[PDB]
Write an enzyme that holds these catalytic residues in place. Structure first.
Site, PDB file in Angstrom:
ATOM      1  N   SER A  29       0.827  -1.208   0.000  1.00 25.66           N
ATOM      2  CA  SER A  29       0.000   0.000   0.000  1.00 25.66           C
ATOM      3  C   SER A  29       0.860   1.255   0.000  1.00 25.66           C
ATOM      4  O   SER A  29       1.794   1.390  -0.789  1.00 25.66           O
ATOM      5  CB  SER A  29      -0.915  -0.033   1.220  1.00 25.66           C
ATOM      6  OG  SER A  29      -1.672   1.156   1.336  1.00 25.66           O
TER       7      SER A  29
ATOM      8  N   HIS B 167      -6.867  -6.100  -2.490  1.00 18.83           N
ATOM      9  CA  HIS B 167      -6.157  -5.244  -1.543  1.00 18.83           C
ATOM     10  C   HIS B 167      -6.413  -5.742  -0.131  1.00 18.83           C
ATOM     11  O   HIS B 167      -7.184  -5.160   0.627  1.00 18.83           O
ATOM     12  CB  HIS B 167      -6.591  -3.788  -1.708  1.00 18.83           C
ATOM     13  CG  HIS B 167      -5.494  -2.800  -1.403  1.00 18.83           C
ATOM     14  ND1 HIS B 167      -4.395  -2.612  -2.207  1.00 18.83           N
ATOM     15  CD2 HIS B 167      -5.338  -1.937  -0.374  1.00 18.83           C
ATOM     16  CE1 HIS B 167      -3.605  -1.680  -1.689  1.00 18.83           C
ATOM     17  NE2 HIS B 167      -4.162  -1.256  -0.573  1.00 18.83           N
TER      18      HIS B 167
ATOM     19  N   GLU C  89      -7.376  -2.627  -5.417  1.00 18.78           N
ATOM     20  CA  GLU C  89      -6.259  -3.304  -6.072  1.00 18.78           C
ATOM     21  C   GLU C  89      -6.234  -3.038  -7.570  1.00 18.78           C
ATOM     22  O   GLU C  89      -5.185  -2.867  -8.189  1.00 18.78           O
ATOM     23  CB  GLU C  89      -6.304  -4.825  -5.872  1.00 18.78           C
ATOM     24  CG  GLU C  89      -4.971  -5.495  -6.214  1.00 18.78           C
ATOM     25  CD  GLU C  89      -3.962  -5.305  -5.085  1.00 18.78           C
ATOM     26  OE1 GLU C  89      -4.239  -4.499  -4.178  1.00 18.78           O
ATOM     27  OE2 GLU C  89      -2.893  -5.938  -5.069  1.00 18.78           O
TER      28      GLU C  89
HETATM   29  O1  LIG Z   1      -3.667   0.781   2.789  1.00 16.06           O
HETATM   30  C1  LIG Z   1      -3.312  -0.417   3.484  1.00 16.06           C
HETATM   31  C2  LIG Z   1      -4.490  -0.975   4.268  1.00 16.06           C
HETATM   32  O2  LIG Z   1      -5.079  -1.993   3.404  1.00 16.06           O
HETATM   33  C3  LIG Z   1      -6.284  -2.513   3.943  1.00 16.06           C
HETATM   34  O3  LIG Z   1      -7.283  -1.505   3.984  1.00 16.06           O
HETATM   35  C4  LIG Z   1      -7.646  -1.086   2.661  1.00 16.06           C
HETATM   36  O4  LIG Z   1      -8.382  -2.128   2.015  1.00 16.06           O
HETATM   37  C5  LIG Z   1      -9.456  -2.631   2.843  1.00 16.06           C
HETATM   38  C6  LIG Z   1      -9.958  -3.877   2.156  1.00 16.06           C
HETATM   39  O5  LIG Z   1      -9.090  -4.988   2.372  1.00 16.06           O
HETATM   40  C7  LIG Z   1     -10.482  -1.510   2.991  1.00 16.06           C
HETATM   41  O6  LIG Z   1     -11.588  -1.974   3.782  1.00 16.06           O
HETATM   42  C8  LIG Z   1      -9.821  -0.287   3.627  1.00 16.06           C
HETATM   43  O7  LIG Z   1     -10.729   0.785   3.785  1.00 16.06           O
HETATM   44  C9  LIG Z   1      -8.577   0.124   2.808  1.00 16.06           C
HETATM   45  O8  LIG Z   1      -7.887   1.193   3.433  1.00 16.06           O
HETATM   46  C10 LIG Z   1      -6.118  -3.089   5.337  1.00 16.06           C
HETATM   47  O9  LIG Z   1      -7.402  -3.343   5.917  1.00 16.06           O
HETATM   48  C11 LIG Z   1      -5.269  -2.247   6.274  1.00 16.06           C
HETATM   49  O10 LIG Z   1      -4.746  -3.042   7.348  1.00 16.06           O
HETATM   50  C12 LIG Z   1      -4.065  -1.648   5.575  1.00 16.06           C
HETATM   51  O11 LIG Z   1      -3.391  -0.654   6.359  1.00 16.06           O
END
Ligand SMILES: OC[C@H]1O[C@H](O[C@H]2O[C@H](CO)[C@@H](O)[C@H](O)[C@H]2O)[C@H](O)[C@@H](O)[C@@H]1O
Ligand SMILES: OC[C@H]1O[C@H](O[C@H]2O[C@H](CO)[C@@H](O)[C@H](O)[C@H]2O)[C@H](O)[C@@H](O)[C@@H]1O
Length: 284
Positions: free
Chosen positions: A125, A261, A229
């Site tokens: 990310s 993602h 993603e």
């Molecule tokens: O940006 C890194 C984060 O990724 C995840 O969160 C993202 O993607 C989620 C879906 O898997 C969404 O619900 C969320 O709003 C997004 O920001 C992860 O959940 C986090 O732990 C990471 O920091």
């Protein structure tokens, strides 16, 4: 084992940020090379996401690699910010490039005999671009950079404003505080596509992963994970084209026809890249 591993919960003073940075740590032994595992956009202040969501420590115990997990810096992009990092919760000083590239390695060398050079940084990310920028500008320290599911051209077009949105949604930070208006040269400086010539000249080993937004049985089958993603995938493809075009020759490009993602896919990559890390960093 998961319990019973020599995992520490260090408190590393950061002069630059005026506080103690917690750092989860597992030595690979005296003079072992380090692997910095950088957390995602929503980094919490108690535990790094890599510890929460994977058995990373377990996978890397006895690998000859030290595992270093800084804690905190939600929305920081592991950058040195222009101004205080003020979000919903208050202001914090963000000087993560300073911390990661001097205060932390010096402390780890002095206090744990971790080799301060020849390290890898692996980020997902937000931290995926950061890993590459750390290697772009600090190639002695970071000779390997892993980027998982990151926006790799953040200074271009909608880039700056998408970053603003995300920082806002994650802790309510503002991108202006970090690299300033999109006009500021800080954006280009922290854009890994822009810094590709550095990566090539330093012959930085790269591991670049991005899923395609289709979940398999691993899970993460939800719209936000899928949409996020897929959205960052093209910057990953354009990075690949540019890197090759610039004479890049030390990267692994991982763009499977699956992946959302979600931590399930990131863990799978971290696990997958262990032997490569050992060879590239000389763990043996
Ligand atoms: O940006 C890194 C984060 O990724 C995840 O969160 C993202 O993607 C989620 C879906 O898997 C969404 O619900 C969320 O709003 C997004 O920001 C992860 O959940 C986090 O732990 C990471 O920091
Ligand atoms: O700034 C993010 C990316 O924006 C462009 O591509 C995006 O826009 C479309 C969706 O609205 C699609 O082309 C794609 O899914 C997105 O990634 C730009 O082409 C990319 O380089 C940027 O990374």
């Amino acid at each position: 084992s998961r319990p019973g591993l020599p995992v520490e919960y260090l408190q590393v003073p950061s002069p630059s940020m005026g506080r103690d940075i917690k750092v989860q740590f597992q030595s690979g032994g005296n003079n072992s090379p380090a692997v910095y595992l950088l957390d995602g956009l929503r980094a919490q202040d108690d535990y790094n996401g890599w510890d929460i969501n994977t058995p990373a420590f377990e996978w890397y115990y006895q690998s000859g690699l030290s595992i270093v997990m800084p804690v905190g810096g939600q929305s920081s992009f592991y950058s040195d910010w222009y101004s205080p990092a003020c979000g919903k919760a208050g202001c914090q000083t963000y000087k993560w490039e300073t911390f990661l590239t001097s205060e932390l390695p010096q402390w780890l060398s002095a206090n744990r005999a971790v080799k301060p050079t020849g390290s890898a940084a692996i980020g997902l990310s937000m931290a995926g671009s950061s890993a590459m920028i750390l290697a772009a500008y600090h190639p002695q320290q970071f000779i390997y950079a892993g980027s998982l599911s990151a926006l790799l051209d953040p200074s271009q077009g909608m880039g700056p404003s998408l970053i603003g949105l995300a920082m806002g949604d994650a802790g309510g930070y503002k991108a202006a505080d970090m690299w300033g208006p999109s006009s500021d040269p800080a954006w280009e400086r922290n854009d890994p596509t822009q810094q590709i010539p550095k990566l090539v000249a330093n012959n930085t080993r790269l591991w670049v992963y991005c899923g395609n937004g289709t979940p398999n049985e691993l899970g993460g089958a939800n719209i936000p994970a899928e949409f996020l993603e897929n959205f960052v995938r093209s910057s990953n493809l354009k990075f690949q084209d540019a890197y090759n075009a610039a004479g890049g020759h030390n990267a692994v490009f991982n763009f499977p026809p699956n992946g959302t993602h979600s931590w399930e896919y990131w863990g799978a990559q971290l696990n997958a890249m262990k032997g490569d890390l050992q060879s590239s960093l000389g763990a043996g």
